[PDB]
Amino acid sequence: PFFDVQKRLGLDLDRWMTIQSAEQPHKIPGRCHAFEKEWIECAHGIGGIRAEKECKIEFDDFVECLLRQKTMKRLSAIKRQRDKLIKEGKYTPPPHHLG
Amino acid sequence: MTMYIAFILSTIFVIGFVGFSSKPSPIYGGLGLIVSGGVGCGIVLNFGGSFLGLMVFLIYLGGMLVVFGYTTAMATEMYPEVWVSNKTVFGAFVSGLMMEFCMVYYALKEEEVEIIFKFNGLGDWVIYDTGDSGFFSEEAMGIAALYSYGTWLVIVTGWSLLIGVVVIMEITRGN
Amino acid sequence: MNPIIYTTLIMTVMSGTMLVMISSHWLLIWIGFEMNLLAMIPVLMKNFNPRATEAATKYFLTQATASMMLMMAIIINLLYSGQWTITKMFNPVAMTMMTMALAMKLGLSPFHFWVPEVTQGISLQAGLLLLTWQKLAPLSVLCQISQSINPNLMLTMAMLSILIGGWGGLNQTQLRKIMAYSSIAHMGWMTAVLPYNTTMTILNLLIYITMTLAMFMLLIHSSATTTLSLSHTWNKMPVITSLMMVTLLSMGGLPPLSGFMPKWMIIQEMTKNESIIMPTLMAMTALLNLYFYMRLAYSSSLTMFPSTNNMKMKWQFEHTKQMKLLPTMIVLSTLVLPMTPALSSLN
Amino acid sequence: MNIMLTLLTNVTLASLLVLIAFWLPQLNAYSEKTSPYECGFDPMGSARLPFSMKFFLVAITFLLFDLEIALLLPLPWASQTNNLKTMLTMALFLLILLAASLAYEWTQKGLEWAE
Amino acid sequence: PGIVELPTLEDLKVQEVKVSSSVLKAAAHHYGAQCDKPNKEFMLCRWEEKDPRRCLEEGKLVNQCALDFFRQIKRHCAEPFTEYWTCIDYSGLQLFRHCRKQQAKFDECVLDKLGWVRPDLGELSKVTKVKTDRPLPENPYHSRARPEPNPEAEGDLKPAKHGSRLFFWTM
Amino acid sequence: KTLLHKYSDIPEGTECHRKAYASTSIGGATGLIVSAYSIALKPPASFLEGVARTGRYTFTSAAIGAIFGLTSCISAQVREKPDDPLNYFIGGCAGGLTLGARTRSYGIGAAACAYMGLTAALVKMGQLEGWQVFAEPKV
Amino acid sequence: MMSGRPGRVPLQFLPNEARSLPPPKLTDPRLVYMGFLGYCSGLIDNAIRRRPVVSAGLHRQLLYVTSFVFFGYYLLKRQDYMYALRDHDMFAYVKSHPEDFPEKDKKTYGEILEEFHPVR
Amino acid sequence: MPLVYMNIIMAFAIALAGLLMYRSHLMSSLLCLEGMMLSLFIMSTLIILNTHFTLANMMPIILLVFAACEAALGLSLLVMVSNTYGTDYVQNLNLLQC
């Protein structure tokens, strides 16, 4: 906040939605609750300058959980390689993954 | 074929989006928005957002109705334009269809699109999450908390809309 | 417009800007901008002249486009970070989208062809309110997000503003038009120092607010809108235009007038950051701003201009309106250099 | 599946009825049977020039009021909360401003239709 | 950036209880009261460890205790239970409101033949306590080392040395 | 902007063809920007004259880029001295006269030489020195 | 350079911590100049309002100077507080980080090789 | 970041492009203005639903509340420009060139 009246006046106006690990209705946790919880607990009061260099892997795990960028990339490679291998005829899916 | 309707629905959303962005006659622009708006409601419904999907359906329909209700009121052309009509709108239209159809071709043939951000084609069904929701729909309880957790948002939204009626009369009054 | 509705319409504008400077949530910041735009459009077309309608219109499309781009840049930041707090932007495209999204609200780079004629069409009263109050909100957002700003883009935003603002003012006669380009010139000055020290642009904002305020309500008292119409004020009100000299000199930064305090203090800060070529540049191109200030000074009372015989009974009557802080505003707008170290109060 | 099959069947049924509407009855038409209807005598030339109605002010407030009903739509699930005092105060608050907007719209000509 | 220690398939080969949802819905209250101890222990492992891969065995105990509950019901009140869950299954929403009479047969059967009392309203929703002998996981989230705090702000304040120290301002 | 660094990728003097081509591309690219604006805010009349205006500005800017390319490499080759502000200075009426010849006029062309003369000298000064324009915030 | 330092209570003009600093002297030339600003503002007021400039209504004039000195006083107290804070984080960080500010030995003029440029 | 994100992001670009190329109609211009609002609403809905950001599900609603509010402002401005100048092509309001 530019002029932090919420901190001074000691009431909440929007510091209840700004994060995913806040008190959600009926304690419905978000997808990446644990990932961001570690990240915020990591860089709390340390400052933005120190946060961007020290709490880096915690952010990367959290940002990955948000998008699954690498995990979906891993799945994309599994399916593509499986497709060409099955199409050529080296190996066929086992009966558990048919029914 | 029912592989994942998300892309198909979003494609019609873009083609409908292309339409009124090409500057037709305003009434035909309403149709181009409505198809995108209707299918956009379909996209959100498919993602679990049942309430929000029909929500944008009801509000927009009323919103765009007064839009082209106005165009025939005082913005109508004595000879209205059409999707073909002038070469400018024709050029603006066909440009949009060939554009989007190029990106989707660019999208579905390598699955590693890197325009601006990263876009990999693997299926929007994947990003879904495994887990129950108890006996409540998550979206409905989230927008229900507006009256319990969002009392600040209600005040600013209510006051702005009340001011919204004041400006509308004050602007339109004149003299 | 009835007086009571006008007050509440203004209070909504001040509340909309205040919401921007106190909220920590990106959606609320966007809301504060939306309320600011919504309550201002009626203010511009208060008198309902034909000009004001498209003047208010050009306001609307420009700022709505800016607001929509700002919303989009917020959304990407949420997508890549899952955060609504105003700390920094974790997607470079998200930031590189907001700079112009906020710029068009400020009117700095070629996102500025709305500022001149929106000032021209609307009345002088809303012109003052447009060029001073409407800049606290977008600048406040920039000050908070000042950490994650692309210096190459932000500096170019300001450098373009100074050049165009100075160049454009040389070919203006309508006093409102010259004020808009002059305001655009000061836009670059405040925004150039933004990446380095945010305390400095606050200081330049405060000085520029007093300059634009004191200049405008002098124009209100003179009841003039073009250079020729201002010229005759020497016959009626000599002190107003004589005071207008010092404010014009101060607005050009000619020291030891208060207007030097930003231009001086800013240059000192960037040279601390090994920026030398660029500070020399705006030092050079601030002079074209000074040109049409002196031409205004020459035309107002430095050389008494031909008068009109219909001015006799004009001298027989005095102003009934009661501009306040005008005697105060001139003091801060002219002589505060001895209290320069007070910038640390902002810090 | 179920919803889209129902949507499909309705539009095919409607379109088929159009197809048999314009094809089963054969046509013996000319340029005078296609003339626009104006209760007999010749039209003076209209139906696309600006036809300015008067309820534009209340037409656009409907759009504002339709947003109020969007805001107060989630009320059925809002009652299932543990802090009804705050929910009741806010729920009535939106209704009050909705009533207040209508009342102020009423007093200043407003709902009156321009002459 | 590591491995994933998926448990042996053998570990995921415990007895898989086979009753339809209506059968479980009919047992409900009586099952909850007479099978709470293994149920509570397993979920406490679920909430504490936050890792089912560390709580399979507690899941197995639930299945074994679930079997004994259902093994007893066939041995004693198979018929009224079969009458009851059939009546629940017909309804599309599986409401207890429409099968009170069959319920009245069922609960009295297990009361006078298996010593079971239907828990009162809200009784099954109470918060329970268990005495699990597993240790509390010190790092359930496997949190990394917390960052060191920035140098603390302290010390006494004295007048600024030589005033503002900015250009020609001596004071 | 990678094409801009392509000027520094090839060392001065050598690759005189490449340096001229690089600056021609730099000029032509910048020519597209100004033409794109001018065709936008200054109203056109037809497609034919619109590209004609585009062609004129692109021709000047590409030519201005080219000659500064040749003058830079040949000067660093005839003297065999890379680090020389004069190497870019001789680009003065190289650029000024040609731009004043593309729109043939002695007034603009002759008066031009100095302006990008020292400018080309000054950009060479920052090339050799550690001068920065858009300096990041150190303090 | 200071809005992010820990313990900075927002919207709080003069911290209770700042009372340990010398209050600005009443004779402080910075303060008395701000009084002149009030005096000058009074004269400007009568000029626009077409009043007997210097000898016009003193109550309007005397209010201006009395107001300016007051808001001048707390601004001057805030002046030195921030500067003292600048000088507080100055030396605490210098002591906390000694190695990046090494102590320079003495290498007196009798030993430097510094040359003399012949000014002829 | 699957292809549905590409579709609506690229969609918003054409809404941006469509708005920034006023051809002959203010009403059609306002159409592209409200067009932007679809992609922003739809993308926002996809984000906070995918991430189960339940408390943030109100954000698409508040977008719509301030959405039609601008839409009303645009048409109300369009009322007078068309009323006193006859049509809505954005070319006849150049009296403010000087």
DSSP F71-101: HHHHHHHHS--SS-HHHHHTHHHHHHHHHHH
Alpha helices in chain G (DSSP H): 29-48, 58-96
Name residues whose C-beta falls within 8 Å of residue C7's C-beta, 6 or more positions apart in sequence.
none
Helix (H, G, I), strand (E, B) or coil at C173: coil
How far is residue C306 from each of residues C10, C25, C316, C317, measured CA to CA in Å?
A: 40, 58, 19, 20
CA distance G27 to G24: 8
Determine the number of helices (DSSP H) and then strands (DSSP E) in chain A.
5, 0
Asked if residues C12 and B137 have their Cβ atoms less than 8 Å apart, the reply is no
Helix (H, G, I), strand (E, B) or coil at F119: helix
- Nearest Cα to Cα of residue C221 among C116, C124, C330, C300: C124
Q: What does the radius of gyration of chain F's CA atoms come to, in whole angstroms?
A: 16
D105/B162 CB distance under 8 A: no
CA distance B10 to A91: 36
Q: What would the two tokens of residue D15 be?
A: 């379109």
Asked if residues C82 and A62 have their Cβ atoms less than 8 Å apart, the reply is yes
Residues of C in contact with H98 (CB under 8 A): 174
| Number of Cβ atoms within 10 Å of the Cβ of E91 | 13
Neighbours of chain B (3+ CB pairs under 8 A): A, C, D, H
- Nearest Cα to Cα of residue H47 among H60, H29, H62, H37: H60
For residue C207, give how far its alpha carbon lies from the nearest alpha carbon of chain E (Å).
Answer: 19
H52/A30 CB distance under 8 A: yes
Q: What is the DSSP code (8-state) at residue D80?
A: S
With tokens 């708006």, the residue in question is: B37
How far is residue F89 from each of residues C280, C297, F75, measured CA to CA in Å?
A: 22, 41, 10
E151 — phi, psi (to 5°)? -45, 125
CA G119 from chain centre, in angstroms, equals 43
Torsion of CA G18, G19, G25, G31, to 10 degrees: 40
Nearest to G12 among A1, A8, A47 (CB): A8
CA distance B32 to E81: 60
For residue H92, give how far its alpha carbon lies from the nearest alpha carbon of chain B (Å).
Answer: 14
Q: Is A34 on the interface with H (CB under 8 A)?
A: no
Name residues whose C-beta falls within 8 Å of residue F5's C-beta, 6 or more positions apart in sequence.
none
Residues of A in contact with H55 (CB under 8 A): 16-17, 22, 24-25
- Nearest Cα to Cα of residue C289 among C202, C191, C163: C163
Q: What would the two tokens of residue G44 be?
A: 């400007």
> What is the torsional sign of CA C87, C90, C94, C96?
positive
Q: Please, what is the end-to-end C-alpha distance for chain A in angstroms?
A: 56
Resolution value, angstrom units: 3.5
Q: If you count them, how many residues does chain G have?
A: 120
- Nearest Cα to Cα of residue C289 among C184, C137, C197: C184
For residue B150, give how far its alpha carbon lies from the nearest alpha carbon of chain H (Å).
Answer: 9
Q: What is the DSSP code (8-state) at residue B113?
A: B
What chain G residue is nearest to A6 in terms of C-alpha separation? Answer: G10
Residue type, C137: A
Residues of E in contact with A41 (CB under 8 A): 143, 146
For F9-48, b/e burial (b = at least 16 CB within 10 A) is ebebbeebebbbbbbbbbbbbbbeeebeeebeeeeeeeee
Q: What would the two tokens of residue E103 be?
A: 């319920």
CA distance F77 to H10: 50
Please indicate, yes or no, if residue D24 is contained in any of the structural domains. yes
Residues of G in contact with A4 (CB under 8 A): 10-11
Of the residues C5, C30, C33, C72, the best mutation for testing chain B's interface (the one with the most B CB atoms within 10 Å of its CB) is C5
Neighbours of chain E (3+ CB pairs under 8 A): A, C, G
How far is residue H73 from each of residues B67, C39, C55, C61, measured CA to CA in Å?
A: 12, 10, 14, 10
- Nearest Cα to Cα of residue C33 among C126, C187, C139: C139
Name residues whose C-beta falls within 8 Å of residue C144's C-beta, 6 or more positions apart in sequence.
A1, A2, C86
B141/A28 CB distance under 8 A: yes
Helix (H, G, I), strand (E, B) or coil at A93: coil
State which approach was used to obtain the coordinates. Answer: cryo-EM
Residue type, F30: T
Burial class (CB in 10 A: 0-12, 13-18, 19+), C208: buried
Q: Which residues 6-45 of C have a C-beta within 8 angstroms of G?
A: none
For chain G, give the residues followed by a break (C–N over 2.5 Å).
1
Q: What is the DSSP code (8-state) at residue C302?
A: I
Asked if residues C214 and C247 have their Cβ atoms less than 8 Å apart, the reply is yes
Asked if residues H42 and B40 have their Cβ atoms less than 8 Å apart, the reply is yes
For residue G30, the number of C-alpha atoms closer than 13 Å in the C-beta half-sphere is: 23
CA distance G79 to G74: 8
Name residues whose C-beta falls within 8 Å of residue B82's C-beta, 6 or more positions apart in sequence.
B24, B25, B28, B89
- Nearest Cα to Cα of residue C68 among B151, B52, H43: H43
- Nearest Cα to Cα of residue F27 among F72, F53, F57: F57
Neighbours of chain G (3+ CB pairs under 8 A): A, C, E
Residues β-bridged to residue B113: B119
- Nearest Cα to Cα of residue C142 among C204, C59, C80, C82: C204
Asked if residues G75 and C206 have their Cβ atoms less than 8 Å apart, the reply is no
Asked if residues C59 and C118 have their Cβ atoms less than 8 Å apart, the reply is yes
Please indicate, yes or no, if residue D115 is contained in any of the structural domains. no
Of the residues A35, A40, A46, A60, the best mutation for testing chain E's interface (the one with the most E CB atoms within 10 Å of its CB) is A46
How is chain B split into domains, by residue range?
A: 5-173
Q: What is the DSSP code (8-state) at residue E83?
A: H
Residue type, F105: S
Residue type, H51: T
Name residues whose C-beta falls within 8 Å of residue C80's C-beta, 6 or more positions apart in sequence.
A63, A66, A67, C90, C91, C94
B119 — phi, psi (to 5°)? -140, 110
Q: Which residues 9-28 of B have a C-beta within 8 angstroms of H?
A: 10-11, 13-14, 17-18, 20-26
Nearest to B160 among H25, H54, H66 (CB): H66
Residues of C in contact with B170 (CB under 8 A): 1, 5, 9, 42
Q: Is A32 on the interface with E (CB under 8 A)?
A: no
For residue H81, the number of C-alpha atoms closer than 13 Å in the C-beta half-sphere is: 29
Burial class (CB in 10 A: 0-12, 13-18, 19+), B72: middle
CA distance C52 to B168: 16
Q: What would the two tokens of residue D90 be?
A: 């806010």
- Nearest Cα to Cα of residue E35 among E84, E10, E69, E86: E69
CA distance G81 to G84: 5
Q: What would the two tokens of residue F36 be?
A: 């794109």
**Rama region for C254: left / alpha / beta (φ>0; ψ in -120 to 50; rest):** beta
D102 — phi, psi (to 5°)? -65, -40
- Nearest Cα to Cα of residue D88 among A12, B148, H62: B148
What chain C residue is nearest to F123 in terms of C-alpha separation? Answer: C277
Q: Is A47 on the interface with G (CB under 8 A)?
A: yes
Q: What is the DSSP string of E131-164?
A: ---SPPPS-TT---PPPPPP----S---PPTTTT
C25 — phi, psi (to 5°)? -105, 135
Q: Report the greatest alpha carbon distance in chain G.
A: 73
Asked if residues C144 and A48 have their Cβ atoms less than 8 Å apart, the reply is no
Alpha helices in chain C (DSSP H): 3-22, 26-44, 50-81, 92-106, 115-121, 124-132, 136-144, 151-169, 175-192, 198-222, 227-231, 233-236, 238-251, 260-272, 277-285, 287-297, 312-315, 326-334, 343-346
G11/A45 CB distance under 8 A: no
Specify the CATH class of H3-92 in words. mainly alpha
G86/C344 CB distance under 8 A: yes
D78/B144 CB distance under 8 A: yes
E86 — phi, psi (to 5°)? -65, -40
Of the residues B51, B65, B136, B147, the best mutation for testing chain D's interface (the one with the most D CB atoms within 10 Å of its CB) is B147
Alpha helices in chain H (DSSP H): 3-19, 26-50, 58-85
Name residues whose C-beta falls within 8 Å of residue C339's C-beta, 6 or more positions apart in sequence.
G30, G33, G34
Q: What is the DSSP string of C30-65?
A: HHHHHHHHHHHHHHHTSS--HHHHHHHHHHHHHHHH
For residue A20, give how far its alpha carbon lies from the nearest alpha carbon of chain G (Å).
Answer: 24
- Nearest Cα to Cα of residue G18 among A6, C344, A1: C344
With tokens 């009074």, the residue in question is: G42
CA distance G67 to G61: 10
Residue type, E64: Q
For residue C209, the number of C-alpha atoms closer than 13 Å in the C-beta half-sphere is: 14
- Nearest Cα to Cα of residue B148 among D82, D97, A22: D82
CA distance F83 to F124: 8
Asked if residues C178 and C145 have their Cβ atoms less than 8 Å apart, the reply is no
Helix (H, G, I), strand (E, B) or coil at C25: strand
**Rama region for E156: left / alpha / beta (φ>0; ψ in -120 to 50; rest):** beta
Helix (H, G, I), strand (E, B) or coil at B119: strand
> What is the torsional sign of CA C95, C100, C104, C108?
positive
Name residues whose C-beta falls within 8 Å of residue F28's C-beta, 6 or more positions apart in sequence.
F58, F61, F62, F65
With tokens 């340390």, the residue in question is: A46
What chain B residue is nearest to D104 in terms of C-alpha separation? Answer: B166
Please indicate, yes or no, if residue D114 is contained in any of the structural domains. no
Q: What would the two tokens of residue F29 be?
A: 């690219």
Total domains in the fold of chain D? 1
Asked if residues B120 and A72 have their Cβ atoms less than 8 Å apart, the reply is yes
CA distance C101 to C306: 47
Name residues whose C-beta falls within 8 Å of residue C198's C-beta, 6 or more positions apart in sequence.
C143, C146
Torsion of CA A40, A45, A49, A50, to 10 degrees: -80
Q: Is E162 on the interface with G (CB under 8 A)?
A: no
Q: Which CATH architecture has domain B5-173?
A: Up-down Bundle (1.20)
Of the residues E162, E165, E169, the best mutation for testing chain C's interface (the one with the most C CB atoms within 10 Å of its CB) is E169
Determine the number of helices (DSSP H) and then strands (DSSP E) in chain F.
6, 0
Q: What does the radius of gyration of chain D's CA atoms come to, in whole angstroms?
A: 25
- Nearest Cα to Cα of residue H5 among B33, G3, G7, B107: B107
E19 — phi, psi (to 5°)? -140, 145
Of the residues G8, G11, G12, G89, the best mutation for testing chain A's interface (the one with the most A CB atoms within 10 Å of its CB) is G11
Please indicate, yes or no, if residue D1 is contained in any of the structural domains. yes
Residue type, B98: M
Asked if residues C263 and C192 have their Cβ atoms less than 8 Å apart, the reply is no
| Number of Cβ atoms within 10 Å of the Cβ of B11 | 18
For residue C195, the number of C-alpha atoms closer than 13 Å in the C-beta half-sphere is: 23
CA distance A34 to A36: 6
CA distance G37 to G19: 27
CA D95 from chain centre, in angstroms, equals 22
CA distance C159 to E12: 67
Q: Please, what is the end-to-end C-alpha distance for chain E in angstroms?
A: 59
With tokens 């005759």, the residue in question is: C232
Asked if residues B122 and H2 have their Cβ atoms less than 8 Å apart, the reply is yes
What chain E residue is nearest to C337 in terms of C-alpha separation? Answer: E169
Name residues whose C-beta falls within 8 Å of residue B48's C-beta, 6 or more positions apart in sequence.
B137, B138, B139, H49
CA angle at H35 for the pair H30 and B162, rounded to the nearest 5°:
65
Asked if residues B92 and B23 have their Cβ atoms less than 8 Å apart, the reply is yes
How far is residue C68 from each of residues A21, C62, C201, measured CA to CA in Å?
A: 28, 10, 26
Helix (H, G, I), strand (E, B) or coil at E105: helix
Q: What does the radius of gyration of chain G's CA atoms come to, in whole angstroms?
A: 25
CA distance C194 to C196: 6
Angle between helices F47-78 and F91-102 (to 10 degrees): 160
Name residues whose C-beta falls within 8 Å of residue H48's C-beta, 6 or more positions apart in sequence.
B142, H54, H56, H57, H59, H60
Q: Is C39 on the interface with B (CB under 8 A)?
A: yes
Asked if residues B96 and H17 have their Cβ atoms less than 8 Å apart, the reply is no
Torsion of CA B79, B85, B88, B92, to 10 degrees: 120
What chain C residue is nearest to H20 in terms of C-alpha separation? Answer: C65
Asked if residues C85 and C29 have their Cβ atoms less than 8 Å apart, the reply is no
A24 — phi, psi (to 5°)? -75, 160
Determine the number of helices (DSSP H) and then strands (DSSP E) in chain E.
4, 0
Alpha helices in B75-113 (DSSP H): 87-108
Name residues whose C-beta falls within 8 Å of residue E4's C-beta, 6 or more positions apart in sequence.
none
- Nearest Cα to Cα of residue C340 among C250, C271, C282, C258: C258
Q: Is C269 on the interface with H (CB under 8 A)?
A: no
CA angle at C243 for the pair C237 and C246, rounded to the nearest 5°:
150
